[PDB]
Amino acid sequence: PESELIRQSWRVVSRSPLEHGTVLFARLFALEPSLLPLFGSSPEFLDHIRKVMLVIDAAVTNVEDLSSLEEYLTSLGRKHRAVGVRLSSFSTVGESLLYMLEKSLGPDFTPATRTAWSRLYGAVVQAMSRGWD
Ligand code: HEM
């Protein structure tokens, strides 16, 4: 019931991944402008947006069994720690993801859809958090 809400809402976003990823990152810097220096240039920034959207694509494909990605996501967390990202900043990324989905879906972004996404994103960050251990 939750795996279908995620798949169906992600299909709408998948129609334009850099456009939607760009809304997510614009929200992220509005909330936590201190993050912007962690990036490099414009092509590096835009390519990172594509990389984030591909990781969420993999999380959506594996939504019924995210443990199959836990080692990959742990390594991703280690890489983010290595380049100076604080684990706390991932809560603001989650708020920015839910913002971008609400703007993309409007009234189709039901509380059940939001809650499903909150849980999926939380499982992704729980796996990544191991990289800060
Ligand atoms: C505040 C949040 C974040 C910051 C500051 C950040 C920053 C970075 C930086 C500096 C890199 C290395 C340079 C690069 O490849 O462009 C990187 C790599 C990456 N990030 Fe992020 N990141 C954030 C959140 C995320 C999230 C939430 C995901 C996925 C859900 C993600 C996916 C990636 C991927 C796939 C890479 C490439 C790793 C590799 O080469 O093996 N990022 N990120």
Residue numbers in the entry: 4 to 136
Q: What do the authors report?
A:
Notably, the dissociation of His64 and the subsequent diatomic gas (O2, NO, CO) ligation to the ferrous iron triggers the sliding of the heme deeper inside the internal Ngb hydrophobic cavity and the movement of loops such as the CDloop and the EFloop.
We determined the crystal structure of the ferric murine Ngb CDless mutant at a 1.8 Å resolution, which according to Arcovito et al. is structurally indistinguishable from the reduced ferrous structure. Consistently, the refinement of the heme density for Ngb CDless MON1 and MON2 indicated the presence of a double heme insertion, along with double conformations for His64 and His96, in proportions similar to those previously reported. More in detail, the refinement based on the residual Fc–Fo difference map allowed us to estimate that canonical and reversed hemes are present in a 29:71 and 33:67 ratio in MON1 and MON2, respectively. Iterative rounds of modeling and refinement enabled us to reconstruct the protein segment between the C- and E-helices (CElink) of MON1. However, the poorly defined electronic density for this region in MON2 prevented the determination of the CElink structure between Phe42 and Pro59, suggesting a highly mobile conformation.
